[PDB]
Design a protein around this ligand. Structure first.
Ligand code: ANU
Ligand code: ANU
Ligand code: ANU
Lengths: 241, 243, 241, 242, 240, 253
């Protein structure tokens, strides 16, 4: 291997320059299977990678695991291997009452409630998505006529307190996040997830292109959800090759 | 009879306008409105000069913001009170990237928040991101005129001098926070420096208002009229696609 | 035509002036200048309108700063480049103390830094303090004409609305940082709110320039004026030449 | 499942109140194999769990995945399931010249270079380990005579810039971390890893006991990346905390 | 006269001492030194009163720090300059947990940094953590002496009043940062409040010096706004 | 509870005899020295680093109470004196200047301080200015002229430490944390006159609570110069600053 965690070589990519990066290792093959010539490359820790072809061009599908830390590793190492465009496809919890489960959300930028983004750029730097990528995802969503929402996403380092969930062992939420969901709601934030702030910030600050699309699994205020989002990211990828 | 404290405008003055082109300089307002139909001066107070025009049958506003986020936040807030829901920032700018030459146009997707006013609307973690529809319209408008466009991040500073790491000053000093900062932004891909977008984009993105920004490159420190006109033509054309 | 980028002034225009009275509104410039000898217009570009006058045979400058720290920072810097060493800001303001009434004059000793520009000159730990000689001159000038004067701290905000905790706005909301802030500043003895002193005082105190500020209260949140505050700033300037 | 990510029920724990939490899912079975009656429970995302028995008491081994975010989910849900004591066993990069690859490092407290810890306590709060757990780990390392070091650990949200690694795609390190390794080194910090700040902070601020131990796989004073003792110690330490 | 600027002590005055017991009140220095062999007064300047004593044939220093991290940082630094490598703070404290009783002994593993001096040695992310051997010696010494002991986190405040959310004050005002803070620390398991440990533990842990912290509970905040000394002395014995 | 209205100072309101102004030096040993410049001085109490005396100035009761080193001990003294009735505080110290033109023996009157402390934050957020009261500053400047000293009026850097916070490297570790590396040069360039360790807390806690506070100090050493005053760096310069704080107090009664 040429990289420390992924266990991949540059030749394994076969010139691929775009990568679809879901969070769950088990979703990798499902995505790769939607394209031509899907082939498993490796599986180490939460990093499962597959290669496939889209319109004749090699494409990579690699899981990031949950959180900005594991995401930063996958992105960095894929970048070392030649990837220049990253499209995250995940699951999300909507916090706006007009966003129903199954809906598709395309993120323009994220509220940085993580710690990893800070390892790439100061907080003043926007965790903004690449225009080309965001455009491709939006156009793709329209192509299949999915109910799409485009906007800001709150990206948290935690699934519980950072998303102001009180149904926990302690039932406590630190001052910083107490009442934070209502604040994000009033600010128009669409949803919560846990990897976009790191992904977008590390890419926008290093000349890498990144997009973010997610399927609504819950509304903080069923199956054809992921499929639609997955179809969208694969279609978007076609326009970014 | 004004409905707002600084702009000296009434909702009636807007004639139903919901979109506003917001340049920084009052002297540029008429020239912009002059590109549209039935342009009429509304008012002039402080750095806030406003004109009303018509685009494809719809009333549009052109109002200056003055220099800086503080002045901008006043114009935007009061315009919002008057009914404006879409704001398009137009201006001329320098550049900090070698590949960006004078005459090019820049469309800002998001801004580095080197201001103070944005913090009065959303914590620093919140992105000073532009509205997708506005950014799309600006890029495509730039497209239709064959403009050489650069789409990316802009550093928005509360100062013209130290915040943009200029040393040709009275003190010749730059506070620790900004020493070596220009090279850091360059390495991070930032296209340029300007002084109102962080405030504009943040206050709009966090209040359900649509905002976008386009600027003509007239200078490049790392290295005049046509550039401007193009930028101006682009913002008006974009406005047309957002009414 | 000009030795500076924005003001459109040359050192020659100042005729050796070392002190400038800096109101925020360009319209107030001529009126202030008119109280001195040989007043004459100098230039007008953007929100920067300048006039020159004379006091006790010494040249004095009156130049507007526009609204906010950003425009103020430009004016102060360029005036400093032209030779100005003493700056006296004069404005109108809204008091937040129940016993500071409309018509009263306020002399600021230092300001709460609720701006962004002051940070481009000194870290937050540094005090946005006024020069002692300037503050003394303003206080002594205020007492020579018998105005009801209050000397103390002022809150300097980058915004007219949320930063001064106003809810009579489009969104009707105030970000967490500022919710309940006016009551806190009140309890801390802060006299009023304005929008340029934090930047002015900080940039001058950290660069060897003298700055002071006086303002007339024309309204009180908790429930001719120009002429007096203006009279005070000119009499004070006289003592600083 | 009683929890959203682990796919476990309280019954799966069989009364277990202590969990050994490695970062790598593939290390779980290996740890469980050193104990009695090892049984696989589940595997979802980066969370692989096994149950085993130690001195007639049930013990859980569950991976956290890399980083504080994944770790915070594992710890929280295990806590919901009844776990009250957590012992992290991981791998680490030493930043002191005389620490050898293979050495066992027991963490007393961590430098919070993460973001998740802040979701449980403000930065002023110490990412300190529980005294009983730390004592158990040290004492255990003592009974098997392993080369051990006890001290502070820098816990980063990134493997690369946050640990000041420059052999990267960009080759740059943001201002905040430029020259940071030298500073931690001068401050006596022993090593780098990526989960302790979160683990220790979230546990110490919620009445949960946590211990941290790791084996050195690279010495950063020499190289950024390399070309069972710690595992035996965490199991033996666990015996003492039952 | 004096090899250090504030303490008025010379390296010769320590007679090879490498461990110092550092109480806050200068008036308690003599008392502590009295529990050991050959106690001798060394100096008294400002809030710094120092005595030298002997424990199991080894020189030991007892020196007051005065109240707060600033005065503490001076004493620790200058004592370090004179050769001290291990510091054991012994103080008084107010418990904020209902189960901790007045008279109980508290051993601090790490402190919440509500001070400013610690930041002069390490950024906030760094833990104000006690030395492991010192903490162990204190816990063990507590068993030996016999006392209801609690081991845990301590909140170290730069103020006695607003920082410990006390309202019995002239203004009766507590700044936003500290409003409702005591209940937050309570929920997070913090045992008590004191004012020197964050600075002490941080400056020591970040400079290769060993530090331990033990205190006697003199009040319990959930109710209102000699074991420890014997324990710190016994712990010192185990650390020589 | 041994006839004290406060927890640390061991003083009662009766002890102040109506005093409303307090001179607050840092060293308890200097309290008696300062009280000696006034009439009928009497020692009130001595507890921890808090030594207090009462004296008469132009026939009015005045308190002199040490604060100890640092904002924490200072905040205790000021708060408890406030509870007892003090409304005006004048700090008098000896300090080391960081400006080349500020010579030993000079007197420094502080208008505001750089908050390099932690206690000030317990009274007001960092954005708040650690500014001195105008009346107090005026009295100190005027008294300086009555005495005839070479005075400098300006900003002071108030640090929670004597060593790294004042960027001193002659220490056990010989290192200075990132935040303070190169900080002295920055403060010098910003016109900061000197370093001391109590003003940020004193000025902030008073300005944010309706109390008046002033700060004056004698320059007994200069961080930029090679030579250092003899055995008595303090005494003469110290006496100058002390004479001034007392003279200033007279105008604030
Ligand atoms: O509220 C939600 C809903 C879904 N997700 C989320 N927050 O975080 C994302 C993690 O990858 C993981 C957390 O379960 O899946 C995504
Ligand atoms: O330098 C190192 C060496 C090892 N580790 C580390 N940093 O972070 C820990 C992650 O879980 C993962 C990163 O590879 O393993 C641990
Ligand atoms: O609540 C309390 C109780 C006791 N102490 C404290 N806070 O701070 C410690 C100081 O040294 C001094 C403060 O009085 O004594 C310690």
């Amino acid at each position: 291997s040429d990289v420390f965690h992924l266990g991949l070589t540059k030749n394994d990519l076969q010139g691929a320059q775009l990568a679809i990066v879901p969070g769950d290792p088990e979703r990798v093959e499902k995505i790769a299977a939607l394209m031509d010539k899907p082939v498993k490359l490796a599986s180490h820790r939460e990093f499962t990678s597959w290669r496939a072809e889209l319109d004749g061009k090699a494409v990579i599908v690699c899981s990031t695991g949950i959180g900005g830390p594991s995401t930063s590793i996958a992105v960095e190492e894929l970048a070392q291997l030649g990837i220049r465009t990253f499209l995250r496809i995940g699951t999300t919890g909507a916090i706006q009452p007009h966003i129903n489960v199954g809906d598709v959300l395309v993120t323009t930028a994220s509220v940085r409630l993580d710690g990893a983004s800070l390892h790439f750029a100061p907080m003043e730097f926007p965790a903004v998505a690449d225009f080309a990528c965001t455009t491709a995802l939006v156009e793709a969503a329209k192509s299949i006529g999915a109910t799409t929402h485009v906007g800001v996403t709150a990206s948290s380092d935690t699934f519980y307190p950072g998303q102001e969930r009180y149904d926990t062992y302690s039932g406590r939420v630190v001052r910083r996040f107490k009442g934070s969901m209502e604040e994000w709601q009033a600010m128009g934030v669409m949803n919560y997830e846990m990897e976009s702030a790191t992904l977008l910030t590390m890419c926008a600050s290093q000349g890498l292109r990144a997009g973010m699309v997610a399927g609504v699994i819950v509304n903080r205020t069923m199956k054809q959800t992921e499929s639609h989002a997955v179809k969208i990211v694969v279609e978007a990828a076609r326009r970014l090759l």
